[PDB]
Design an enzyme around this catalytic site. Sequence first.
Site, PDB file in Angstrom:
ATOM      1  NE  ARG B  89       2.562  12.854 -20.397  1.00  0.00           N
ATOM      2  CZ  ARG B  89       3.612  13.681 -19.912  1.00  0.00           C
ATOM      3  NH1 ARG B  89       4.643  13.836 -21.055  1.00  0.00           N
ATOM      4  NH2 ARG B  89       3.896  14.486 -18.963  1.00  0.00           N
ATOM      5  CD  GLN B 172     -11.267  32.638 -26.977  1.00  0.00           C
ATOM      6  OE1 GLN B 172     -10.698  33.397 -27.541  1.00  0.00           O
ATOM      7  NE2 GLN B 172     -12.431  33.062 -26.148  1.00  0.00           N
ATOM      8  CG  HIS B 176     -13.668  27.699 -27.253  1.00  0.00           C
ATOM      9  ND1 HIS B 176     -12.610  27.433 -26.539  1.00  0.00           N
ATOM     10  CD2 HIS B 176     -14.612  28.640 -26.683  1.00  0.00           C
ATOM     11  CE1 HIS B 176     -12.537  28.316 -25.518  1.00  0.00           C
ATOM     12  NE2 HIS B 176     -13.852  29.120 -25.655  1.00  0.00           N
ATOM     13  CE1 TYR B 324       8.544  18.610 -22.140  1.00  0.00           C
ATOM     14  CE2 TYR B 324       7.520  17.344 -23.722  1.00  0.00           C
ATOM     15  CZ  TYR B 324       7.678  17.569 -22.514  1.00  0.00           C
ATOM     16  OH  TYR B 324       6.362  16.960 -21.678  1.00  0.00           O
ATOM     17  CG  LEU B 353      -6.950  20.879 -17.815  1.00  0.00           C
ATOM     18  CD1 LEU B 353      -5.956  21.252 -18.821  1.00  0.00           C
ATOM     19  CD2 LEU B 353      -6.549  19.111 -17.359  1.00  0.00           C
ATOM     20  CE1 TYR B 354      -6.031  22.529 -23.624  1.00  0.00           C
ATOM     21  CE2 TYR B 354      -6.170  24.767 -24.120  1.00  0.00           C
ATOM     22  CZ  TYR B 354      -5.493  23.601 -24.258  1.00  0.00           C
ATOM     23  OH  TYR B 354      -4.686  23.156 -25.008  1.00  0.00           O
ATOM     24  CG  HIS B 357     -10.382  32.799 -19.114  1.00  0.00           C
ATOM     25  ND1 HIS B 357     -10.982  31.724 -18.482  1.00  0.00           N
ATOM     26  CD2 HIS B 357     -10.948  33.054 -20.291  1.00  0.00           C
ATOM     27  CE1 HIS B 357     -12.226  31.603 -19.358  1.00  0.00           C
ATOM     28  NE2 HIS B 357     -12.017  31.984 -20.249  1.00  0.00           N
ATOM     29  N   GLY B 495      -3.150  17.555 -18.432  1.00  0.00           N
ATOM     30  CA  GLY B 495      -3.539  18.081 -19.832  1.00  0.00           C
ATOM     31  C   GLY B 495      -2.750  17.265 -20.777  1.00  0.00           C
ATOM     32  CB  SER B 499      -3.626  17.056 -24.939  1.00  0.00           C
ATOM     33  OG  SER B 499      -3.298  17.778 -26.266  1.00  0.00           O
TER      34      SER B 499
HETATM   35  C1  HEM Z   1     -10.605  36.640 -25.446  1.00  0.00           C
HETATM   36  C2  HEM Z   1     -11.588  36.953 -24.672  1.00  0.00           C
HETATM   37  C3  HEM Z   1     -12.311  35.950 -23.875  1.00  0.00           C
HETATM   38  C4  HEM Z   1     -13.511  36.271 -23.213  1.00  0.00           C
HETATM   39  C5  HEM Z   1     -14.292  37.426 -23.349  1.00  0.00           C
HETATM   40  C6  HEM Z   1     -13.911  34.707 -22.729  1.00  0.00           C
HETATM   41  C7  HEM Z   1     -14.738  34.446 -21.908  1.00  0.00           C
HETATM   42  C8  HEM Z   1     -15.363  33.391 -21.528  1.00  0.00           C
HETATM   43  C9  HEM Z   1     -16.532  33.025 -20.827  1.00  0.00           C
HETATM   44  C10 HEM Z   1     -17.579  34.261 -20.604  1.00  0.00           C
HETATM   45  C11 HEM Z   1     -16.775  31.500 -20.893  1.00  0.00           C
HETATM   46  C12 HEM Z   1     -17.921  30.874 -20.019  1.00  0.00           C
HETATM   47  C13 HEM Z   1     -19.341  31.502 -21.051  1.00  0.00           C
HETATM   48  C14 HEM Z   1     -20.109  30.353 -21.135  1.00  0.00           C
HETATM   49  O1  HEM Z   1     -20.062  29.350 -20.007  1.00  0.00           O
HETATM   50  O2  HEM Z   1     -21.094  30.436 -21.831  1.00  0.00           O
HETATM   51  C15 HEM Z   1     -15.450  31.178 -21.111  1.00  0.00           C
HETATM   52  C16 HEM Z   1     -15.322  29.722 -21.086  1.00  0.00           C
HETATM   53  C17 HEM Z   1     -14.067  29.311 -21.581  1.00  0.00           C
HETATM   54  N1  HEM Z   1     -12.767  29.931 -21.690  1.00  0.00           N
HETATM   55 FE1  HEM Z   1     -13.158  31.580 -22.241  1.00  0.00          FE
HETATM   56  N2  HEM Z   1     -12.673  34.035 -22.845  1.00  0.00           N
HETATM   57  C18 HEM Z   1     -11.950  34.426 -23.356  1.00  0.00           C
HETATM   58  C19 HEM Z   1     -10.648  33.909 -23.798  1.00  0.00           C
HETATM   59  C20 HEM Z   1     -10.194  32.666 -23.804  1.00  0.00           C
HETATM   60  C21 HEM Z   1      -9.011  31.982 -23.741  1.00  0.00           C
HETATM   61  C22 HEM Z   1      -7.710  32.989 -24.695  1.00  0.00           C
HETATM   62  C23 HEM Z   1      -9.051  30.528 -23.491  1.00  0.00           C
HETATM   63  C24 HEM Z   1      -7.705  29.622 -23.615  1.00  0.00           C
HETATM   64  C25 HEM Z   1      -7.928  28.470 -23.839  1.00  0.00           C
HETATM   65  C26 HEM Z   1     -10.257  30.401 -22.983  1.00  0.00           C
HETATM   66  C27 HEM Z   1     -10.629  29.339 -22.417  1.00  0.00           C
HETATM   67  C28 HEM Z   1     -12.122  28.779 -22.053  1.00  0.00           C
HETATM   68  C29 HEM Z   1     -12.488  27.540 -22.067  1.00  0.00           C
HETATM   69  C30 HEM Z   1     -11.846  26.266 -22.075  1.00  0.00           C
HETATM   70  C31 HEM Z   1     -13.907  27.499 -21.585  1.00  0.00           C
HETATM   71  C32 HEM Z   1     -14.923  26.614 -21.245  1.00  0.00           C
HETATM   72  C33 HEM Z   1     -15.899  26.789 -22.789  1.00  0.00           C
HETATM   73  C34 HEM Z   1     -17.031  25.544 -22.606  1.00  0.00           C
HETATM   74  O3  HEM Z   1     -17.024  24.537 -21.865  1.00  0.00           O
HETATM   75  O4  HEM Z   1     -18.084  25.787 -23.257  1.00  0.00           O
HETATM   76  N3  HEM Z   1     -11.061  31.509 -23.060  1.00  0.00           N
HETATM   77  N4  HEM Z   1     -14.836  32.005 -21.645  1.00  0.00           N
HETATM   78  O1  LIG Z   2      -2.470  20.193 -25.849  1.00  0.00           O
HETATM   79  C1  LIG Z   2      -2.215  20.579 -24.673  1.00  0.00           C
HETATM   80  O2  LIG Z   2      -2.704  21.958 -24.053  1.00  0.00           O
HETATM   81  C2  LIG Z   2      -0.992  20.426 -24.132  1.00  0.00           C
HETATM   82  C3  LIG Z   2      -0.321  19.204 -24.413  1.00  0.00           C
HETATM   83  C4  LIG Z   2       0.650  18.670 -23.956  1.00  0.00           C
HETATM   84  C5  LIG Z   2       1.325  17.397 -24.156  1.00  0.00           C
HETATM   85  C6  LIG Z   2       2.680  17.230 -23.732  1.00  0.00           C
HETATM   86 CL1  LIG Z   2       3.593  15.754 -24.043  1.00  0.00          CL
HETATM   87  C7  LIG Z   2       3.302  18.058 -22.941  1.00  0.00           C
HETATM   88  C8  LIG Z   2       2.786  19.385 -22.662  1.00  0.00           C
HETATM   89 CL2  LIG Z   2       3.683  20.491 -21.830  1.00  0.00          CL
HETATM   90  C9  LIG Z   2       1.396  19.580 -23.195  1.00  0.00           C
HETATM   91  O3  LIG Z   2       0.901  20.879 -22.925  1.00  0.00           O
HETATM   92  C10 LIG Z   2      -0.304  21.270 -22.739  1.00  0.00           C
HETATM   93  C11 LIG Z   2      -1.045  20.669 -21.693  1.00  0.00           C
HETATM   94  F1  LIG Z   2      -0.561  19.446 -21.085  1.00  0.00           F
HETATM   95  F2  LIG Z   2      -2.368  20.868 -21.572  1.00  0.00           F
HETATM   96  F3  LIG Z   2      -0.619  21.432 -20.626  1.00  0.00           F
END
Ligand code: HEM
Ligand SMILES: O=C(O)C1=Cc2cc(Cl)cc(Cl)c2O[C@@H]1C(F)(F)F
Lengths: 552, 552
Positions: B89, B172, B176, B324, B353-354, B357, B495, B499
């Site tokens: 990886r 999340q 974050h 797995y 990619l993460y 939502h 991913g 990761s």
């Molecule tokens: C639970 C309620 C949630 C709300 C209301 C929400 C809302 C948001 C909002 C509004 C943003 C962009 C806001 C900004 O740009 O300042 C954001 C970004 C993001 N969200 Fe969510 N979200 C939720 C849950 C989740 C979940 C479960 C994940 C799963 C991993 C997730 C992953 C992400 C990621 C990776 C970003 C980019 C953050 C960054 O780059 O700072 N969120 N979300």
């Molecule tokens: O850290 C993560 O979110 C992940 C790590 C990860 C790592 C291996 Cl080896 C295999 C899977 Cl399915 C994985 O699933 C996720 C991803 F890749 F983001 F979808």
Amino acid sequence: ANPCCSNPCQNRGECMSTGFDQYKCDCTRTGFYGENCTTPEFLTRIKLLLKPTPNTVHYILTHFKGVWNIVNNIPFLRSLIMKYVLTSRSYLIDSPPTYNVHYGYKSWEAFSNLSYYTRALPPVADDCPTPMGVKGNKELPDSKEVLEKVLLRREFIPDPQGSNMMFAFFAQHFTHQFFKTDHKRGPGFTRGLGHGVDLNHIYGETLDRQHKLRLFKDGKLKYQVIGGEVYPPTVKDTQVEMIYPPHIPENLQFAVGQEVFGLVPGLMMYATIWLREHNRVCDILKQEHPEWGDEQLFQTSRLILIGETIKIVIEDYVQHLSGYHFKLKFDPELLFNQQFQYQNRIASEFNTLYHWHPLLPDTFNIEDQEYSFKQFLYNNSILLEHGLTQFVESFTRQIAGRVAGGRNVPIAVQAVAKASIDQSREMKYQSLNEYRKRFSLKPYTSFEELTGEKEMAAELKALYSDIDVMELYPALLVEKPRPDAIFGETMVELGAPFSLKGLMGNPICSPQYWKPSTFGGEVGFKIINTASIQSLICNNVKGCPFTSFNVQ
Amino acid sequence: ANPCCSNPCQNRGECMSTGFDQYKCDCTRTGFYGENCTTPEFLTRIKLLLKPTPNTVHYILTHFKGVWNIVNNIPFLRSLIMKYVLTSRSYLIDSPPTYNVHYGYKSWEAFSNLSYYTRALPPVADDCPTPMGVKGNKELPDSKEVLEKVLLRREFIPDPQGSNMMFAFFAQHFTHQFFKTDHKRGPGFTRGLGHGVDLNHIYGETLDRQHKLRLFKDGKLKYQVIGGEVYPPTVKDTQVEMIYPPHIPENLQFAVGQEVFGLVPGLMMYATIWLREHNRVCDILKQEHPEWGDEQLFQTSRLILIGETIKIVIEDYVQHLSGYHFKLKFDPELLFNQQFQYQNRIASEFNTLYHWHPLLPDTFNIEDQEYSFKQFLYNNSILLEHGLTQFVESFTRQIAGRVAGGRNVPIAVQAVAKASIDQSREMKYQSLNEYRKRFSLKPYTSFEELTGEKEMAAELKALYSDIDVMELYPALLVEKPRPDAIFGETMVELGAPFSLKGLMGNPICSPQYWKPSTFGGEVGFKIINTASIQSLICNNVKGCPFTSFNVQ
Ligand code: HEM
Ligand SMILES: O=C(O)C1=Cc2cc(Cl)cc(Cl)c2O[C@@H]1C(F)(F)F
Ligand code: HEM
Ligand SMILES: *[C@@H]1O[C@H](CO)[C@@H](O[C@@H]2O[C@H](CO)[C@@H](O[C@@H]3O[C@H](CO)[C@@H](O)[C@H](O)[C@H]3NC(C)=O)[C@H](O)[C@H]2NC(C)=O)[C@H](O)[C@H]1NC(C)=O
Ligand SMILES: *[C@@H]1O[C@H](CO)[C@@H](O[C@@H]2O[C@H](CO)[C@@H](O[C@@H]3O[C@H](CO)[C@@H](O)[C@H](O)[C@H]3NC(C)=O)[C@H](O)[C@H]2NC(C)=O)[C@H](O)[C@H]1NC(C)=O
Ligand SMILES: CCCCCCCCO[C@@H]1O[C@H](CO)[C@@H](O)[C@H](O)[C@H]1O
Ligand SMILES: O=C(O)C1=Cc2cc(Cl)cc(Cl)c2O[C@@H]1C(F)(F)F
Ligand SMILES: *[C@@H]1O[C@H](CO)[C@@H](O)[C@H](O)[C@H]1NC(C)=O
Ligand SMILES: *[C@@H]1O[C@H](CO)[C@@H](O)[C@H](O)[C@H]1NC(C)=O
Ligand SMILES: *[C@@H]1O[C@H](CO)[C@@H](O)[C@H](O)[C@H]1NC(C)=O
Ligand SMILES: *[C@@H]1O[C@H](CO)[C@@H](O)[C@H](O)[C@H]1NC(C)=O
């Protein structure tokens, strides 16, 4: 009170307290076990037998010139040897880094905070009974006494290796990109957050400073022309902050990457040479890439100069210092099938050991003139006066002082030497012998063994009483030199590892970086792979005077 | 106009312009040669034949449960397999890092500036004729149109892998800490300068914030007790900045490492759990080390929690996600005889990619209640209302949405999905298929191949016209899932590398760190090596409720 105050654990074992008056050593991967990690594993015993001492290896590298002559001409042999010098050295450095002045145990703070110099050995804990841990008296000897008795120059002692002033000022200029102590914070802190060879001393630490230094055409750095010659621009023109005494006229306040480089004309000489080299490489790249803009010309040139710098440091600078008959090579590929971390953190101890002020002569001799320190410092008129060509010619001829061997620190700079002693203690450095062990060297068993003579040895013995209480910094400058060498064993054996790691650890040496396209193609790549201290001066100094790091 | 606009060079060859309308590919170490690095070297052809596709390998990992059962119980076999998944990886990630949003060529600026997210693929140059380079129309399809036709949820589609809300909120919370976009600078910039798992989301980015969060006794973090339960302290008590709407009463403004964590009770749940864990580990260490002070207790505990975090992420979190039958292992030693860079830089594409939502349900169901987004957001009373035990029980039972497969983005969060599209374009992302090639996957030859169905495929085809013009982010959420899986091929294959690299690249995984003394001894070390999502909840939540990342 800390039960680890005696530094109980040997062979890189880690000491941890297990109660107010108990400790434990973690011997993981040391090759030893037992309470203090002093019992060797079977395979460890073998290796210890078949391992030559550093003095033995040094002898072999500096002798049999006829064999080395053959080896140096068999590419795969030369590569094999250099690969070994690279790898054997780097295993002495912790990477990722560990300790710093405030943490004698690993912590996220010590790992993550780039403002600190790292530490090859942790500091002596604050609640230890003596400065060195448990040995010696409650207080180290008067630093002024050490200074005066064994450090200060009576008569100038020339370097038997023939190091000249071109060498001395290259060392100062080059190293002062990564040795930049943040005196606002303390001796254990740095302002060089790149922790290596990033040429911030040409381009600036920060983007803001860089942009003030840049012309924004053709990738070039601002400059001025005086008497037909190219020099750095002024503070007045650029608004970059420089340190100058208040009596310096604005038209003599040259602005360069490193704010302190106006303080010595020898520094400004190299500042000017490299400025020229950058603009020179810009012209070459523009010719190859008429499609390129200013940013890309500037960035690519900077990458090329980083390469030239590392090339020259290994194959000219360290080559000279080593006295090896083996021909050192700058070749990133040598590490590609090897385990190696492309990263580095500047060590406090590397900084300490590099205080090579004995290099400095009693006067600076340019042309017919012999300048005193007083006249030389902050005096860029001298540079304008004689010009670059004459600086190079004169500095190539003037011999530098021997560093190890004792009593060769110029009086003009005695305050700096005293501060090296005082700040080492302030940073709670462990003893010379702890550092010797840390770098796989045999502890010295007497002061006479250290100096290889009787007089300074006796003075040191009266001062310190116990050899195990002797301090690293004074020891380095007083150590018995290798035969006709500038340094003793301890300088080379600590310095080499720190150095090669910061050189090869640079990202341009990594596989994804070390390819032609990174440097604008084969033409840019060639600039790196053919760089030398002579070509650097030939291309950028009028008349292409001959130069070298040794007195001809 | 840039001759590299068309992404000419294949197999990781690098494109460089050699004139206004000519280019050259640097095929160094690609395994290919030729104008576009498409001609394979002999040994390269072999390897290509003996290389199974990612779908094949995935099949083998998710089948033959009886064999895996045996393998999982042969320590040296399990280690061999996990070592291979680690190494295969990480070779996909550039380290040291290269490009960023502003540099499509390597530069010291792109290397040294930690405020940028790095880029697995360089941006499309600004003067390219189309958004993707040379293909497609002058403008990408209306993002609102893409959003509405193929992204927005009609009916909630549950995850066939049984992911629950404990999983969703862990993802999340955990991510974050390193996904923290600096919206003041732009989408290509980050506030998480540790670029990984440093637990700044518990402890704070900066020393100042950390110190406000700390009790400065016994290494602990400040906390309050409400109804006999331990919760984070208040903004009023600590003065740490948190983002809260103006109507939130000060006594409900919980202060934690990550300023945004008050915005969702599910986040605050994990913030509280981990706060408890830290103080818990402090008690354990104090018992082992009555001689230790507050600093050392705090720092060591942080290191232990970093370990627990990586342990749980690999062996519980990723284990669940992977499907797995092979039992993944957190074991730094597996890399010790291997080439591997203990460093990492967070990729913009990893962030993109993460955006998972679609995991979010239409309502959040706690006990007898079903809260709407409106009621759930910024509402910590709900947490106080039901308490941690009930949160864990409920969230363990509530199923999360499927991520790939299309049309499962909750309407409540449609603005976020549109922004992901718009900001990707803003950051000049290359196409889905370029990214597929970049990660050794076969380009999709039709929209129907991408989705594995007809209706969404037809909508996408009418919008984009050309499959080679399709965008990464929408493609990820619309992609044909693995059978009964939460994700499709592209999500996992991009991913996984990002990761594992950030996990194993952590310094605590390096040889000089990965030993008992680093973690206060065998007892601290054991806390890491036995960590699980269940033990985290069991040690820290009243009644030791049952938990899992899947619905029971
Ligand atoms: C639970 C309620 C949630 C709300 C209301 C929400 C809302 C948001 C909002 C509004 C943003 C962009 C806001 C900004 O740009 O300042 C954001 C970004 C993001 N969200 Fe969510 N979200 C939720 C849950 C989740 C979940 C479960 C994940 C799963 C991993 C997730 C992953 C992400 C990621 C990776 C970003 C980019 C953050 C960054 O780059 O700072 N969120 N979300
Ligand atoms: O850290 C993560 O979110 C992940 C790590 C990860 C790592 C291996 Cl080896 C295999 C899977 Cl399915 C994985 O699933 C996720 C991803 F890749 F983001 F979808
Ligand atoms: C040319 C005349 C020189 C003068 C006047 C000079 C003076 C100084 C001074 C005043 C300091 C600050 C020390 C303190 O904190 O008390 C210093 C630091 C230092 N000097 Fe020199 N020096 C000279 C040449 C050199 C040379 C040739 C070297 C050899 C490489 C050298 C190596 C160093 C180093 C490594 C530091 C520490 C830098 C830092 O940590 O910021 N100096 N010098
Ligand atoms: C790397 O470590 C350095 C040493 O700890 C940090 O520098 C110190 O940061 C502290 C917190 O900001 C400063 O503490 C002082 O504390 C008192 C009480 O709150 C305040 O009155 C001061 O305003 C506050 N700062 C100052 C400048 O007085 C330390 O003073 C400060 N400097 C030193 C040398 O300790 C660096 O912050 C740290 N770097 C990072 C990125 O964390
Ligand atoms: C990592 O790269 C970032 C993006 O280039 C740098 O951020 C930019 O730094 C600039 C100055 O250093 C700011 O430009 C503005 O320029 C004018 C001209 O002098 C000034 O008047 C402004 O005060 C100055 N700043 C502001 C906020 O107006 C950029 O604004 C700033 N931000 C962006 C998004 O570019 C980072 O500095 C850099 N980080 C490091 C460590 O070098
Ligand atoms: C809820 C079941 C319908 C799902 C299909 C959505 C079709 C796109 O419809 C959109 O819905 C958005 C969210 O309500 C609205 O904001 C937009 O005005 C509307 O165009
Ligand atoms: O970078 C340096 O200054 C050095 C690098 C260096 C490197 C090797 Cl392999 C051998 C010698 Cl003699 C070296 O000499 C010096 C040192 F070590 F600091 F004294
Ligand atoms: C380590 O050496 C022996 C244990 O074999 C013990 O006598 C000694 O006290 C230990 N440590 C020190 C500093 O002496
Ligand atoms: C500086 O050097 C100039 C030119 O060589 C000389 O004339 C002048 O006296 C020097 N100034 C000092 C302070 O020594
Ligand atoms: C790469 O493929 C061949 C050269 O072998 C050539 O026809 C083609 O134009 C090259 N580049 C692109 C983008 O097609
Ligand atoms: C917040 O939660 C409370 C108590 O659980 C709930 O009754 C209320 O409706 C919520 N507030 C809002 C604005 O929805």
